[PDB]
Design a protein around this ligand. Sequence first.
Ligand SMILES: [Ca+2]
Lengths: 49, 37
Amino acid sequence: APTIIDLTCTVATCTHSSDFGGVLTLTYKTDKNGDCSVHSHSNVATLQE
Amino acid sequence: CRIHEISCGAHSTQCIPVSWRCDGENDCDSGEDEENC
Ligand SMILES: [Ca+2]
């Protein structure tokens, strides 16, 4: 499983609506390509993928 | 590379897992995975 170090989060745009009206981006440094299980730990927001 | 990894051709050192191949997306530098599928 790839390891992730020094990850930061910033939000490009957000608009609270029934649709997924908000996009965020994550920057990180890794060693090999692959896949991860991404999750949000609070119910105030719900992801899509 | 790893046993579960394949390089994007002999001319490139980038390695991607086996499930990356033929997924409908140009994962490699110039989409070598989708080539000849
Ligand atoms: Ca592919």
